From a paper:
X-ray crystallography shows that the N-terminal halves of their SNARE motifs bind the CALMANTH domain as helices in a manner that mimics SNARE complex formation. In this study, we provide structural, biochemical and in vivo data to show that the internalization of VAMP8, and consequently that of the highly related small R-SNAREs, VAMP3 and VAMP2, is mediated by specific, direct interactions between the N-terminal halves of their SNARE motifs and the ANTH (AP180 N-terminal Homology) domain of the endocytic clathrin adaptor CALM.
If this hydrophobic trough were indeed the VAMP binding site on CALMANTH, then deletion of helix 11 would be expected to increase VAMP8 binding. This was confirmed by the determination of the structure of CALMANTH(1-264) at 1.7Å resolution (final R/Rfree 0.170/0.191). The dimeric structure explained the lack of VAMP8 binding since the dimer interface (burying 2100Å2 of accessible surface area in total) was the proposed VAMP8 binding site. As there were no other significant changes between the surfaces of CALMANTH and CALMANTH(1-264), these data strongly indicated that the hydrophobic trough in which helix 11 (when formed) sits was indeed the VAMP8 binding site on CALMANTH.
Residue numbers in the entry:
A (entry chain A): 5 to 264
B (entry chain B): 18 to 264
The structure:
Amino acid sequence: SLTDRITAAQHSVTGSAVSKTVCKATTHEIMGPKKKHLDYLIQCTNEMNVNIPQLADSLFERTTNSSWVVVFKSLITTHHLMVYGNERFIQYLASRNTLFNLSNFLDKSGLQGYDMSTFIRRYSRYLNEKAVSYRQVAFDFTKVKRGADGVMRTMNTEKLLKTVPIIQNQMDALLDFNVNSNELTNGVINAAFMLLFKDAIRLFAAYNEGIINLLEKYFDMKKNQCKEGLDIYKKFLTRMTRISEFLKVAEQVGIDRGDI
Amino acid sequence: TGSAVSKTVCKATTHEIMGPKKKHLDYLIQCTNEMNVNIPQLADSLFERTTNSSWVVVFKSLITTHHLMVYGNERFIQYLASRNTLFNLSNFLDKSGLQGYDMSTFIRRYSRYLNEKAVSYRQVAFDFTKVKRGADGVMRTMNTEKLLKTVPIIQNQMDALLDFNVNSNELTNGVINAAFMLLFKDAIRLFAAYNEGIINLLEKYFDMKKNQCKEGLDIYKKFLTRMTRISEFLKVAEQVGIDRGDI
């Protein structure tokens, strides 16, 4: 019908503009994806009639590139949209059967390509885990209400015992980025690191609140729940130790609380 | 007055293998509440009983002292806290029999605990097992600097307590069982205070200085071990029919 052809025309215009901007955000230039392109993509995710699966597909397509720069930038763009985009974006990623498949990515173009490939593998793992974390609880741990009246401080015991290990698993994937400050020496890896830093602070806050809630419930828990809690507590200690190391790397390159 | 106290201390600490009798403990508690009772003389009577060579007399004098620290007027534990020395039983030995040998080990550990309980009280001028709890209580509202100084005091007291290190199959007479019941009541309450200190520290995570975070992390690491030990302590209690109803 005429109505259908007119509608198809608009959807074509829209799709092409998104794909083009994804390419712009993911050029071979060794710099983070440009703000103007990220802002444009964020706005796209907020348009009721933008096609989210097509947007995601464009980003996945860029991760099939052989250039570490294109691949890492597509991952950074995806992360940025998970954080700053409309919730429909992360929700779509959470609904998928598969996400990034980069565990064997390797760019052997040069020493920098080799070094960056390791970080691409670790970062891809983190974004997959971030999506699966969202799927399991239907919310983003880094965004929920905090404080005494917030989500993690008020959660019931049974749900809490299921939920803290999900936070722990996400935090592990995040910290396993395992970069040192002497390695944060190009705008691509630095852009990824800044997003990881913002996530880590917020994710740790949620983790910590979960632990506080569990400790408050100590005398009220069943014997077996106490055992699960103690295991959660013990694992939390090592993650707090690692978070302090992560914060030190950030401080060494001039990233601190002001950047949260 | 003094003679009546001394006599009752003796009755609380006879050679009979049974915990000190309630009627005598109640009498001593009332004594501590009499404005004109002499606390130092009461304490001295208890110390003198711990110079006895019988494990039964010595252990019962320690239990009587512990009972008064817990249930007596606060002037009693305050006086103990003010002393230059307390119990000196680290080499006590009633090598008169197997039971005497076995019990001597527990007397040494228990006396260490009571010394630590008094010194804990001295350092903060209150009893961790008695303070107001909950969101508006002492440990949940304490400021960061004081908290960092205070949790290690709790930890040190808890270590001396758990170091009693008894097994359920060693709890086989009314004397050691009376000491154990007091230790259990202290341990539950002391752990509640310890736990509240930890919660308060965790709440302050993002607000602490770098160095404070390091101190806090050490505190949290040590807390894990004590929680693990408390769990084992609670099982020993459960194995001899002591639980929450006995708190």
